[PDB]
Design a protein around this ligand. Structure first.
Ligand SMILES: Nc1nc2c(ncn2[C@@H]2O[C@H](COP(=O)(O)OP(=O)(O)OP(=O)(O)O)[C@@H](O)[C@H]2O)c(=O)[nH]1
Ligand SMILES: Nc1nc2c(ncn2[C@@H]2O[C@H](COP(=O)(O)OP(=O)(O)O)[C@@H](O)[C@H]2O)c(=O)[nH]1
Ligand SMILES: COC(=O)Nc1nc2ccc(C(=O)c3ccccc3)cc2[nH]1
Ligand SMILES: [Cl-]
Ligand SMILES: [Cl-]
Ligand SMILES: [Mg+2]
Lengths: 426, 155, 426
């Protein structure tokens, strides 16, 4: 039933705040916690993300974490900033300086226990805890370094709970800091072993969408986060609203993850809109299979789909949906592995998102995601070959062979995808 | 030894401690264990004022470490645009190849330093230079779908 | 008067049990509160207040579905202690339903069943409703069947099993669960009536003019067929008067205990003035594949047994004449070691249809239960989907992580291979 949300670091807290603004509006929740909605459907599954306080007040089951005090002040200044439980703000004083080592072994380790005490308090309150949800970047130090430390500590305490992450992947197009490949490679190692699902939210792709499709000369983090919050809203639709699907996180992962290490998804969304600016079902179905709509800078046609889940939101003909979805598979039958029968599934929710009569969200488990990891591995290897900036990490206790291991594990993952990309039914 | 102290002073960016060490005869072209010189380290960590001072006093702009890395390789990898321009102005080999077959254009391409890419091209970067896997800088931009970089490499 | 206890496992079982007991009540003139202004005592106990209470248990590992029974029109009908729910479901994982989560509630389910059996003067056995694809309908059912064979060794056990169809399912692991539960249940079940959701789906579309059938559309049609299969147990007829007789008339060999059901006529409620179909017409429709519960071609197979269960205004002489015509048909080939004959039962009550359903009233209807080798085609389809996924070990880690050994996959698959061979050797 209940989900415990965590958001770590500057990026984690920023996209995490935007997620709560979006689904709160969908559920008709006031910035003070008061429900002021029209429909009863807005409340059926409200307990999944909201604790039901005394005065008919709904309080996000969210924990906010950061070694930087600044980002916490900015959350409260937001529209819904005072909706969060004050005691669920856990922040250090020093900051992470974009150093994965500082977040994972040094400052982060000093603060991780204080964070788990807050997680435990939220958990014991849950009737039947469904899983954990984390938002964070992989290129920084707090979200990447301390986020993955949090995941492994949460995995120890709650081994039988699902752990999904919305992980933002670094791109030179968004932040120029050149240690991000280090931080992301060290983190992806952690995610491969300790998360059940990971949504690859690639800043490369977010920028390209804004810059080339939405024609935004200079995309801001708000332009990028508009795409992220809309994606996260659709990805969690089946959990938050009544409809065909009644599945918990565990059931959603069981049918999407054929292999334990291949749980990194390509999320997509249609239509793509800029902040403040209706498609047919065929135009919706075509768009979300189109490379331009992917939130991970990968071309699906360069790989093969293992599993695909799509959720349509709005009032629309289910039959027309079934036919279009059928139209794509048979037309592109080669891009879907033939050794997982019926691997493309569809769901519909009559309640559309804010400002749209029609929308659809795409969740792909595609071998083409290896293009993302090969891009990071290439940058990682360019820096690591020249040993540039390693002192920042070895000075924080890290061993140098941790870098070789992360690189090695990164490439084993790439090889796994390529293995199943070439396998046949025979 | 004054060479080790000039190396460390150039890494940390201590401008004043560089000229003092150079005032007591510090080897401007001193090498560490891996063959890096003060100019390698100042260019790696964005210390422009030390880069220019070293070049005014006998620094080999095209010195190479054990792995064949020149100062321009490192400045291009890390993204220091001004340092890249100074080095070229003082005769940096725009097409120096290291032990991995990489040229400064390769490393600027890999790391998405588009401004450096353009500068290197304007100074004669070889678009046909192949690394030890056969990739040119344009191959790298196609393989990782970098449309912005590919357009730059085609003009 | 020998009692029968119905057990409904998982969402599919529960929701189909709802439609069945809904229909049972109407056929015996029982109100939703059990009040009534003899024969049906086999399925309904009788209290001192005159309340007729189903001899039924509903079991699910999460409470969403059974909670609607506890608040629907029939909240008064059932024993409340016979509506049993856990809090966390099997996540479409056979292993969860059988090994980890299922074992946390099995003892309670048995004690509640014992309570019902203690009120039986001569318990015949159990009717078990469940899906193949669900983790509860598969894993917990096979666990329940194993435990019932130990505690009720002499009693008979019948299954109504929902065979998976991609058109109305969002799970990809259903082939696994389907073979796993069949393997471990085969030896503990005396007779099993499989319901192919695709067959019910096509019937709802072709005969009932329903473009997008819901689970309610399917279940009302399914319950109409279950009712006609169990009618003999509730109306003191001549044919199949006790559970033991199902096996005698339909199962010449214990492993080949999957009879094919064919029901006719299915007419849309919009055609309230259709010309009534003769006995000969509805009988010939029992040999049209389009009316069968499992999709397969009996013309390829051979009959080992054949029962015709008529309901309504049916004169025995017209049945003998219609069968006389059927025996000339070349498509109907019996095995050489069986009486080439049809066991006939007639229930002169006019068929009942639920108010709110999609079926027109008819004066006469029939259900043919036949044990044909052709149903092995339905096993072949499942076995093939199983083979494609298990060749790459896809999804297997989900099961191994829930108290199951990988060897059980191949052990179950070999059992299926031996079952297909059993059909070939007949
Ligand atoms: N005919 C029919 N089929 C159903 C119904 N509900 C679910 N199914 C089918 O059953 C399969 C899914 O398994 P469920 O029965 O829903 O799962 P479960 O037994 O509750 O076990 P869990 O995995 O723990 O949820 C799919 O093939 C569905 O198409 C129903 O009401 N009627
Ligand atoms: N989309 C998005 N990405 C961000 C945001 N803030 C930082 N990032 C990315 O995250 C990386 C920097 O990590 P950051 O979260 O700032 O470090 P941390 O605070 O220590 O966890 C860079 O790749 C940034 O592009 C944001 O608001 N939105
Ligand atoms: C907080 O973390 C998550 O929300 N994780 C997550 N995983 C998912 C997988 C699938 C879906 C669907 O919408 C769906 C659509 C059609 C058929 C089946 C499922 C939704 C998911 N959400
Ligand atoms: Cl579907
Ligand atoms: Cl006969
Ligand atoms: Mg269920």
């Amino acid at each position: 039933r209940e989900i415990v949300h965590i958001q770590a670091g500057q990026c984690g807290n920023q996209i995490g705040a935007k997620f709560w603004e979006v689904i709160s509006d969908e559920h008709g929740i006031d910035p003070s916690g008061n429900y002021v909605g029209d429909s009863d459907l807005q409340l059926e599954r409200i307990s999944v993300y909201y604790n039901e306080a005394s005065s008919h007040k709904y309080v996000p089951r969210a924990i906010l974490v950061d070694l930087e005090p600044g980002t916490m002040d900015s959350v409260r200044s937001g529209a819904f900033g005072h909706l969060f439980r004050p005691d669920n703000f856990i922040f250090g004083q020093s900051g992470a300086g974009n150093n994965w080592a500082k977040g994972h072994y040094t400052e982060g380790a000093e603060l991780v226990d204080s964070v788990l005490d807050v997680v435990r308090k939220e958990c014991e309150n849950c009737d039947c805890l469904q899983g954990f949800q984390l938002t964070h970047s992989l290129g920084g130090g707090t979200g990447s370094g301390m986020g993955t430390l949090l995941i492994s500590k949460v995995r120890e305490e709650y081994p039988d709970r699902i752990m999904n992450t919305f992980s933002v992947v670094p791109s030179p197009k968004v932040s120029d800091t050149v240690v991000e490949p280090y931080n992301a490679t060290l983190s992806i190692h952690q995610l491969v072993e300790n998360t059940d699902e990971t949504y690859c939210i690639d800043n490369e792709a977010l920028y390209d969408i804004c810059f080339r499709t939405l024609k935004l000369a200079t995309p801001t983090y708000g332009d990028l986060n508009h795409l992220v919050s809309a994606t996260m809203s659709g990805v969690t639709t089946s959990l938050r609203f009544p409809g065909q699907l009644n599945a918990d996180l565990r059931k959603l992962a069981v049918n999407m993850v054929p292999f334990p290490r291949l749980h990194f998804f390509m999320p997509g969304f249609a239509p793509l809109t800029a902040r403040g600016s209706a498609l047919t079902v065929p135009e919706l179905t075509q768009q979300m299979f189109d490379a331009k709509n992917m939130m991970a800078a990968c071309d699906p046609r360069h790989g093969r789909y293992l599993t695909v889940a799509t959720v349509f939101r709005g009032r629309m003909s289910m039959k027309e949906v079934d036919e279009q979805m059928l139209a794509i598979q048979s037309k592109n039958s080669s891009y879907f592995v033939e050794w997982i029968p019926n691997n493309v599934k569809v769901a519909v929710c009559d309640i559309p998102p804010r400002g749209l009569k029609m929308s659809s969200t795409f969740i792909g488990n595609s071998t083409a995601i290896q293009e993302l990891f090969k891009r990071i591995s290439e940058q990682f290897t360019a820096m690591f070959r020249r040993k540039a900036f390693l002192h920042w990490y070895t000075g924080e206790g890290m061993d140098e062979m941790e870098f070789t291991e992360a690189e090695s594990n990164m490439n084993d993952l790439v090889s796994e995808y390529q293995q199943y990309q070439d396998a046949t039914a025979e | 030894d004054l060479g080790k102290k000039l190396l460390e002073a150039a890494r940390a960016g201590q401008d004043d401690e560089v000229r003092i060490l150079m005032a007591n005869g510090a080897d401007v072209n001193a090498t560490d264990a891996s063959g890096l010189t003060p100019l390698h380290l100042a260019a790696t960590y964005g210390h422009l004022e030390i880069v220019e001072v070293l070049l005014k006093h006998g620094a080999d702009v095209n010195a190479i470490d054990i792995m064949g890395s020149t100062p321009l390789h490192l400045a291009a990898l890390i993204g220091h645009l001004e340092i890249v321009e100074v080095l070229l102005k003082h005769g940096a080999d725009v097409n120096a190849v290291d032990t991995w077959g990489d040229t400064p254009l390769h490393l600027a391409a890999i790391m998405g330093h588009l401004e450096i890419v353009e500068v290197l091209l304007k100074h004669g970067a070889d678009v046909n230079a192949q690394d030890k896997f056969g990739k040119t800088a344009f191959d790298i931009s196609i393989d990782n779908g970098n449309e912005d970089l590919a357009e730059i490499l085609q003009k | 008067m020998r009692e029968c206890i119905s057990i409904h496992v998982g969402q599919a079982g529960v929701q189909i049990g709802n439609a069945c007991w809904e229909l049972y009540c109407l056929e015996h003139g029982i109100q939703p509160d059990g009040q009534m202004p003899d024969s049906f005592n086999t399925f309904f106990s009788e209290t001192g207040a005159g309340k007729h209470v189903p001899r039924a248990v509903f079991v699910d590992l999460e409470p969403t579905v059974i909670d609607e029974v506890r608040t629907g029109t029939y909240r008064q009908l059932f024993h409340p202690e016979q509506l049993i729910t856990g809090k966390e479901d099997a996540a479409n994982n056979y292993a969860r339903g059988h090994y980890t989560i299922g074992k946390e509630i099995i003892d309670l389910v048995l004690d509640r069943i014992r309570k019902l059996a203690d009120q039986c003067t001569g318990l015949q056995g159990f009717l078990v409703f469940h899906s193949f694809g669900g983790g509860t309908g598969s894993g917990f059912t096979s666990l329940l069947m194993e435990r019932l064979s130990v505690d009720y060794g002499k009693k008979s056990k019948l299954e109504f099993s929902i065979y998976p169809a991609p058109q109305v399912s969002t799970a990809v692991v259903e082939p696994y669960n389907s073979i796993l539960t069949t393997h471990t249940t085969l030896e503990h079940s005396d007779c099993a009536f499989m319901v192919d959701n695709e067959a019910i789906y096509d019937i709802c579309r072709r005969n009932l003019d329903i473009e997008r059938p819901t689970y309610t559309n399917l279940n009302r049609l399914i319950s109409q067929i279950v009712s006609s299969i169990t009618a003999s147990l509730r109306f003191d007829g001549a044919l199949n008067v006790d559970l033991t007789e199902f096996q005698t008339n339909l199962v010449p060999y214990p492993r080949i205990h999957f009879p094919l059901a064919t029901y006719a006529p299915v007419i849309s409620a919009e055609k309230a003035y259709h010309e009534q179909l003769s006995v000969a017409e509805i009988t010939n429709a029992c040999f049209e594949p389009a009316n069968q519960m499992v999709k397969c071609d009996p013309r390829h197979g051979k009959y080992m047994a054949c029962c015709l269960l008529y309901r309504g205004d049916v004169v025995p002489k017209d049945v003998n004449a219609a069968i006389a015509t059927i025996k000339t048909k070349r498509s109907i080939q019996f095995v050489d070691w069986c009486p080439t004959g049809f066991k006939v039962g007639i229930n002169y009550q006019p068929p009942t249809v639920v108010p709110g359903g999609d079926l027109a009233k008819v004066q006469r209807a029939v259900c043919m239960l036949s044990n044909t080798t052709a149903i092995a085609e339905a096993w072949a389809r499942l076995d093939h989907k199983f083979d494609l996924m298990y060749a790459k070990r896809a999804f297997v880690h989900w099961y191994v992580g829930e108290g199951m050994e990988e060897g059980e996959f191949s052990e179950a698959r070999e059992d299926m291979a031996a079952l297909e061979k059993d059909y070939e050797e007949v």
